[PDB]
Ligand binder design. Structure first.
Ligand SMILES: [Mg+2]
Ligand SMILES: [Mg+2]
Ligand SMILES: [Mg+2]
Ligand SMILES: [Mg+2]
Lengths: 354, 81, 18, 111, 93, 52, 143
RNA sequence: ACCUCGGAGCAGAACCCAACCUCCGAGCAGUACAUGCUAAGACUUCACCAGUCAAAGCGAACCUCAAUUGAUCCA
């Protein structure tokens, strides 16, 4: 009784003859690189990757964004060769490299990272947090234009929302200082939603800030179709994620069926869905910027529930499932004396009929 | 009264351990260095020899080590009085 | 297992002759 | 006349207690063994005597994964450096795919 | 109602209002509850002992807070590396 | 060859614990956890009770 | 009855970062004989080519979150000899900055012994700790 | 000649399986003295007695081996 394999056996391609004329793994990290290379392949037997919740990932995902701007890679490569050749000409750089003392201008590499490869990194961070999973039902994009939104609390500092930061709702008390590059022919729709925080509905989300037809960089001039409202994560619930979205529209499109009243303090009205909202405006606009941050409870959230929303604050708690015990035996053989205490409800003395 | 006596004795023993701790650890280091010094003494005198194993060289080394040990004890006895 | 298609998947001493 | 004497030791009852697909509560012993046969995978620990017990409530799954030893495990490291430049090892692993979420957020007070 | 509770003195009433805001209702009531026993005598006694221990603990503001590191060490490092991101020169309100 | 000796605690008195020991070596002095003081204190070898 | 007060008595949080930020998400315990251990929420992973040095931060399901590599022109132009120690120190500083801007400041570094005794990885861990990012992830709660 | 325990074959792929069947062994040894205390769920030499693994918790630094062994009363 045997059964043949359903495909190639793993160590079968090497030849068992002429073993001493083969190259061995002379190290441990060489084998480690080969084994972690091999563990990524789609094998035909049963593997760890099949069972442990990888969401059945192979299926192409729809891009909805701006195209990549065309660059001539030959000229770029020759100019970069020119630049590193000019840096390699200096000899004090060689002294700094040999002498283990040569730092990097972190702000310059920060702005350059924002300039060249940063959009793809922000795309994979936005997909790690599940933004594209809950904003567009899986449809992905790249945040082509950079964006800078900074929050205002005190006098000197800032608390910026980078991709994935943590800002407290006290620091999110007022509207932030939104800036980005734009030309004088473009209109923009700003949109700030919290992916979590809806109480009545599990899959909906709360619209907090919507500005439409931003004339380029004039962020103040847009029409306030939804007024700014601070975040409000509840107490016992965990971390809540707010996300800004910046779309670029070709022609100036107006909408009043999505517009809200001027207080807008009724939570049934702020029941948003970015999938349906992007479905309505599928052709006129396209997403171009993206920023998002974590938000947990502080003592100003009860102020938000008190004087703005006019409600009592709901608190939560992280409960666990009750512990597992077998069926209670009548004669528990060799169990300890505390076996009876696992099945008791109240640890106070009881007197039945007396 | 006997509860007070026991707890007071435990308090006095607890106060008197940290000094016992450091004394015990210093004595641990001292006998460790003394044992390793004896290892290097048994390694030094076996150096000079011809052949082959310790059938003659190690007995001569042990004889010279016995002479050195008796010399150290004699130096101690002369140092005493 | 010995009757499964993946029998002998953990074989290694047919690779080391020493 | 019976020069040999001694081999009267009984069987150890070792082997797999929970096969693939069996629901397992936390702390159930999955397999007893000597001289490692099934290696521990995700949410499976080992005892001193190489038994495999669950660490979560779930369903047992047996797979076959690549074997990379700990770098201080010197005998396995020399067995790794003795392999040729394409071979990998593929031992057998036991996982527990956990069933319950580790908690839920309930509404306790409305104040 | 904790604000008009006259039998408690003003500074310790303020200290209880600050350090026990998680048990204060919308209308300023301080809500204490118990679930230990199954006779309501012992639950009421536990509630009253909670009130007594809160009052006698808040008035002694030299109470020394002993350092714990399991549940607040996370929040300490998160607040520190949230403070590391404060570097501008001009902002207001 | 070996021998089983009783060690008694110094602080937190009365507490004892037994341990094996080589015969020809000198007597033992160890650090051990004494639960009546909930610390590591010194123990002193006293009154060997075996010849194993 | 106020229409604002529908709270729907079980709250569903869909943030994947959530329960491991509450320190109650389960780590993948086990594997107990192979290397590296799978008990982490995030890992530090550095790849040292003969040309470039690249550092990754992964989640244990496999998707990377942030990385700093000398193949990028941004770090390439500002230093010399992308292989050497000061390049790995720069990679550590840039990765620590990039991941503090990502809100992730607990990760595990699990090297081989000869890598942990190397000067490059020592100065990279020093650049990560002096950047504010702390290794040795906290315990699980009711583990 | 043997009376107790462990490993291999008979017993080839869950468990178990005898023989005055064929071969090896054991009645120890070695290092720390947290070889501290408690506590879900399980295995179990086909009964029982015995034996084995162990999540979490309080504290504290940041275990090798295969058998290597003896119940009650009593002292
Ligand atoms: Mg047999
Ligand atoms: Mg039998
Ligand atoms: Mg049985
Ligand atoms: Mg434990």
């Amino acid at each position: 009784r045997r059964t043949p394999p359903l495909g190639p056996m793993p160590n079968s391609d090497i030849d068992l003859s002429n073993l001493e004329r083969l190259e061995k793994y002379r190290s441990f990290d060489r084998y480690r690189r080969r084994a972690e290379q091999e563990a990524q392949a789609p094998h035909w037997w049963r593997t760890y990757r099949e069972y442990f919740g990888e969401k059945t990932d192979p299926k192409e995902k729809i891009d909805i964004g701006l195209p990549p701007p065309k660059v001539s890679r030959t000229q770029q490569l020759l100019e970069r060769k020119q630049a590193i050749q000019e840096l390699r000409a200096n000899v004090e750089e060689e002294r700094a490299a040999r002498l283990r003392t040569a730092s990097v201008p972190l702000d310059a590499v920060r702005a350059e990272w924002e300039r060249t490869c940063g959009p793809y990194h922000k795309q994979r961070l936005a997909e790690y947090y599940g933004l594209y999973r809950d904003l567009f039902h899986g449809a992905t994009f790249v945040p082509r234009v950079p964006l800078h939104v900074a929050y205002a609390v005190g006098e000197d500092d800032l608390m910026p929302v980078y991709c994935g930061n943590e800002v407290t709702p006290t620091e999110a008390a007022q509207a932030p200082e939104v800036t980005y590059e734009a030309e004088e022919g473009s209109l923009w729709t700003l949109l700030l939603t919290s992916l979590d925080g809806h109480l009545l509905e599990p899959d909906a989300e709360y619209l907090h800030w919507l500005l439409t037809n931003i004339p380029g960089n004039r962020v103040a001039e847009g029409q306030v179709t939804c007024p700014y409202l601070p975040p409000f994560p509840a107490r016992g619930s965990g971390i809540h994620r707010l996300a800004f979205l910046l779309f670029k529209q070709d022609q100036p499109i107006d909408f009043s069926e999505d517009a809200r009243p001027s207080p807008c303090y009724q939570l049934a009205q702020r029941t948003f869905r970015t999938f349906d909202f992007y479905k309505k405006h599928q052709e006129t606009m396209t997403p171009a910027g993206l920023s998002f941050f974590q938000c947990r409870w502080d003592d100003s959230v009860t102020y938000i529930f008190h004087q703005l929303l006019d409600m009592r604050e709901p608190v939560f708690e992280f409960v666990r499932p009750p512990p597992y015990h077998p069926k209670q035996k009548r004669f528990p053989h060799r169990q300890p004396l505390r076996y009876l205490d696992r099945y008791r409800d109240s640890h106070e003395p009881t007197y039945g009929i007396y | 009264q006997k509860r007070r006596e026991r707890e007071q004795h435990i308090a006095e023993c607890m106060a008197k351990m940290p000094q016992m701790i450091v004394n015990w650890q210093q004595q641990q280091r001292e006998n460790w260095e003394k044992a390793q010094a004896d290892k290097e003494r048994r390694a030094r005198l076996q150096a000079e020899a011809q052949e082959l194993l310790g059938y003659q060289v190690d007995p001569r080394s042990a004889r010279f080590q016995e002479l050195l040990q008796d010399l150290e004890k004699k130096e101690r006895k002369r140092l005493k009085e | 297992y010995k009757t499964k298609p993946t029998h002998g998947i953990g074989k290694y001493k047919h690779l080391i002759k020493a | 006349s019976s020069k040999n004497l001694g081999g009267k030791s009984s069987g150890r009852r070792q082997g797999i207690k929970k096969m693939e697909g069996h629901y397992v509560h936390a702390g159930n012993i999955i397999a007893t063994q000597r001289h490692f046969r099934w290696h521990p995978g995700a949410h499976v620990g080992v005892g001193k005597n190489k038994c495999l017990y669950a660490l979560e409530e779930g369903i047992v799954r047996y797979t076959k994964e690549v074997y990379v030893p700990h770098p201080r495990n010197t005998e396995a490291v020399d067995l790794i450096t003795r392999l040729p430049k394409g071979a990998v090892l593929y031992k057998t692993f036991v996982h527990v795919v956990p069933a319950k979420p580790e908690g839920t957020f309930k509404l306790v007070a409305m104040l | 109602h904790l604000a008009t509770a006259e039998w408690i003195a003003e500074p310790v009433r303020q200290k209880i209002a600050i350090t026990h805001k998680n048990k204060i209702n919308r209308l300023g009531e301080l809500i204490l509850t118990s679930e230990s026993s199954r006779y309501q005598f012992r639950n009421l006694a536990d509630c009253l002992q909670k009130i007594r221990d809160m009052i006698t603990e808040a008035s002694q503001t030299p109470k020394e807070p002993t350092k714990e590191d399991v549940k607040l060490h996370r929040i300490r490092i998160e607040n520190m590396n949230r403070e590391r991101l404060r570097q501008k020169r001009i902002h207001s309100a | 060859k070996n021998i089983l000796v009783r060690m008694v605690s110094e602080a937190g008195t009365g507490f004892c614990f037994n341990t094996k020991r080589n015969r020809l070596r000198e007597k033992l002095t160890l650090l051990h956890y004494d639960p009546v003081v909930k610390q590591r204190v010194l123990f002193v070898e006293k009154k060997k009770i075996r010849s194993l | 009855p106020v229409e604002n007060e529908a709270v729907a008595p079980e709250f569903t949080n869909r943030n994947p970062r959530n329960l491991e930020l509450l320190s109650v998400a389960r780590k993948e315990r086990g594997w107990r004989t192979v290397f590296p251990s799978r008990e982490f929420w995030h890992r530090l992973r550095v790849i040292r080519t003969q040309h470039h040095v690249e550092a990754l931060v992964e989640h244990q399901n496999g998707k990377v979150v942030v990385s700093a590599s000398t193949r990028e022109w941004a770090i390439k132009k500002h230093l010399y000899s992308t292989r050497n120690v000061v390049a790995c120190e720069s990679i550590g500083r840039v990765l620590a900055q990039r991941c503090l801007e990502a809100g992730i400041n607990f990760m595990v570094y699990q090297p081989t012994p000869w890598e942990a005794a190397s000067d490059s990885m020592k100065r990279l861990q020093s650049a990560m700790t002096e950047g504010g990012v702390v290794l040795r992830e906290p315990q699980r709660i009711y583990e």
